[PDB]
Amino acid sequence: MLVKGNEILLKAHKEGYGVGAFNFVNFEMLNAIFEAGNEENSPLFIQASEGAIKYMGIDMAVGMVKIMCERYPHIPVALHLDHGTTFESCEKAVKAGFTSVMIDASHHAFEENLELTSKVVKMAHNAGVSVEAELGLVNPKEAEQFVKESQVDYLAPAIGKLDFERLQEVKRLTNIPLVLHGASAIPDNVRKSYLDAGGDLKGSKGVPFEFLQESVKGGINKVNTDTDLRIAFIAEVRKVANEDKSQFDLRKFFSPAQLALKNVVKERMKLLGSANKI
Amino acid sequence: MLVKGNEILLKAHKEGYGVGAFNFVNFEMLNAIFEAGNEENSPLFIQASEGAIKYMGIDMAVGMVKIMCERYPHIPVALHLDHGTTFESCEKAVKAGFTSVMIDASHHAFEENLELTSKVVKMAHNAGVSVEAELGLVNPKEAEQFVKESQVDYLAPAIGKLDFERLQEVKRLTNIPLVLHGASAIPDNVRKSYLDAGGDLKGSKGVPFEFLQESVKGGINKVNTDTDLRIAFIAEVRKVANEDKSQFDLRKFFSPAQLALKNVVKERMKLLGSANKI
Numbered sequence: 335m336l337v338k339g340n341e342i343l344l345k346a347h348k349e350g351y352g353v354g355a356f357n358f359v360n361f362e363m364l365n366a367i368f369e370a371g372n373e374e375n376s377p378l379f380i381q382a383s384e385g386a387i388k389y390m391g392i393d394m395a396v397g398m399v400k401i402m403c404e405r406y407p408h409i410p411v412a413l414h415l416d417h418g419t420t421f422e423s424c425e426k427a428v429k430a431g432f433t434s435v436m437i438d439a440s441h442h443a444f445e446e447n448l449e450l451t452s453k454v455v456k457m458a459h460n461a462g463v464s465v466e467a468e469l470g471l472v473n474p475k476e477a478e479q480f481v482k483e484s485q486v487d488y489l490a491p492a493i494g495k496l497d498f499e500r501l502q503e504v505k506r507l508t509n510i511p512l513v514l515h516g517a518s519a520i521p522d523n524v525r526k527s528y529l530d531a532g533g534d535l536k537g538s539k540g541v542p543f544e545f546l547q548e549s550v551k552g553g554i555n556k557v558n559t560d561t562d563l564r565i566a567f568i569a570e571v572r573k574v575a576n577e578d579k580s581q582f583d584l585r586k587f588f589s590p591a592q593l594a595l596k597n598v599v600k601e602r603m604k605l606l607g608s609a610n611k612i
Numbered sequence: 613m614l615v616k617g618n619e620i621l622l623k624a625h626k627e628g629y630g631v632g633a634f635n636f637v638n639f640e641m642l643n644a645i646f647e648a649g650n651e652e653n654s655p656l657f658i659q660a661s662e663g664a665i666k667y668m669g670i671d672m673a674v675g676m677v678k679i680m681c682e683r684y685p686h687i688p689v690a691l692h693l694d695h696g697t698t699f700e701s702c703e704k705a706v707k708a709g710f711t712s713v714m715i716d717a718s719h720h721a722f723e724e725n726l727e728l729t730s731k732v733v734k735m736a737h738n739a740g741v742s743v744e745a746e747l748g749l750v751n752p753k754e755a756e757q758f759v760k761e762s763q764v765d766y767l768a769p770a771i772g773k774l775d776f777e778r779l780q781e782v783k784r785l786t787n788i789p790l791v792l793h794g795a796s797a798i799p800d801n802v803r804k805s806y807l808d809a810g811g812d813l814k815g816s817k818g819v820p821f822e823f824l825q826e827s828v829k830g831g832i833n834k835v836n837t838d839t840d841l842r843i844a845f846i847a848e849v850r851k852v853a854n855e856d857k858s859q860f861d862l863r864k865f866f867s868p869a870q871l872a873l874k875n876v877v878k879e880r881m882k883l884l885g886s887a888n889k890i
């Protein structure tokens with residue numbers, strides 16, 4: 335059911351696996367993510383950006399997740415604000431029923447980042463909500479101080495290829511769950527699916543699978559995944575548009591799109607190590 | 613709020629206007645219908661087919677509607693099962709929170725249609741839910757008996773050019789709200805939008821706007837509207853896919869798709885006479 339972010343990630347931290355954090359913007363994305371978790375027996379970290387929240391309305395973002403939660407009550411799921419930008423934004427998410435919030439203040443100096451993170455932490459912890467923050471390449475010594483002072487629950491350190499030595503140093507010093515941002519891999523089958531549907535990816539490349547695996551071994555426990563899901567989703571939509579010019583049944587477009595998105599999530603759950611962890 | 617279908621249609625009945633009954637299959641469709649109703653100050657009839665219920669899950673179908681209703685508490689909204697095909701399906705919609713159900717038994721002989729409709733009515737009225745049934749072209753004396761025996765709240769008479777004389781006789785004999793099925797009126801702007809995006813409608817003919825207006829003057833009060841919405845929506849999706857083969861932000865595909873659907877709903881509400889009726 336709907337649980338504090340730290341419940342899922344403390345366990346990932348202790349046992350040494352990564353929990354994919356999958357963004358959604360509507361019902362179709364959320365359904366395929368949830369079906370993936372059900373089929374892989376995997377905990378679900380559900381993410382909504384400020385943009386997706388404005389699109390849906392926070393009442394709907396939370397409401398739909400709560401419906402999905404009742405549909406699979408055996409799956410632990412956290413509802414997590416991805417890249418909150420202001421304290422007020424984090425407070426609204428907490429009020430709306432999110433069980434995890436990220437405040438991104440990494441563009442500030444250390445002292446200002448720490449003070450804004452600490453403000454969000456106080457508010458969220460008072461309502462029983464976990465907090466993510468961002469630092470950074472990250473200075474591991476200030477990461478150590480940042481975590482001890484802010485009491486944030488998980489940290490996204492800037493490590494990039496990936497600086498795996500820096501990651502192990504941050505992990506050793508902070509002893510908390512760590513988050514990797516922009517962690518989509520853009521797999522070969524998804525890119526081939528998107529190009530077969532006529533799409534163009536501008537030669538964009540993700541983090542290869544072996545580097546995701548190595549970052550989990552380095553101590554990453556939350557793995558932000560968004561871009562992969564969208565490319566796998568829209569490529570089916572583009573395909574359906576191309577092949578039947580008379581097709582306007584939305585289900586005919588989004589049923590295969592859901593299936594491709596679900597498959598990306600399933601595979602990523604297996605890759606990161608959250609498969610069969612319920 | 614979520615009200616009995618009869619509550620909305622009894623008012624439409626007494627005042628001689630039509631209320632569009634708009635199908636939905638996911639959040640995007642539902643959001644745009646509601647924004648249309650909010651901007652036209654019109655009551656909302658929201659319809660979900662057995663197919664769309666399967667696609668969403670009846671718990672999500674009702675759950676999303678209940679969230680939207682709290683977002684616009686001032687709007688009268690009925691949640692209606694479109695073309696229910698078994699008693700059991702009607703009973704499931706009633707138990708899940710639908711406030712109106714249609715049992716489609718029009719392929720049966722008069723006696724079996726009446727028997728099945730009556731069984732639905734006893735069940736649905738016990739739970740405070742309104743019932744639609746279907747007959748037919750329609751025999752108006754059959755309609756008069758059917759309505760008086762079944763106590764169904766509204767009836768879809770098969771009247772389709774559309775037989776105005778027959779509609780008026782049915783209206784006179786039954787004196788209940790009447791519903792018009794297959795009443796999408798593929799508007800020129802919408803058709804041009806679909807074709808401009810490379811769509812192919814196969815030369816499908818929609819009901820002329822004047823024939824929708826004449827049915828409302830004849831006593832139609834619920835106008836089933838689906839195809840029009842899906843064409844407008846998918847037209848924008850095809851457009852976004854065409855004009856940027858690197859676009860896979862779902863909001864970029866569906867925000868304009870919502871707006872096009874909303875505009876269809878707004879114009880229909882004005883056409884049928886439900887604008888400014890709250």
Ligand code: NA
Pocket residue numbers: 415416417436466558
């Ligand atoms: Na985040």
Ligand code: NA
Pocket residue numbers: 693694695714744836
């Ligand atoms: Na109906």
Ligand SMILES: [Zn+2]
Pocket residue numbers: 417438440468515
């Ligand atoms: Zn950032």
Ligand SMILES: [Zn+2]
Pocket residue numbers: 438468490515
């Ligand atoms: Zn970041």
Ligand SMILES: [Zn+2]
Pocket residue numbers: 695793794836
């Ligand atoms: Zn129909």
Ligand SMILES: [Zn+2]
Pocket residue numbers: 746768793794
């Ligand atoms: Zn029909």
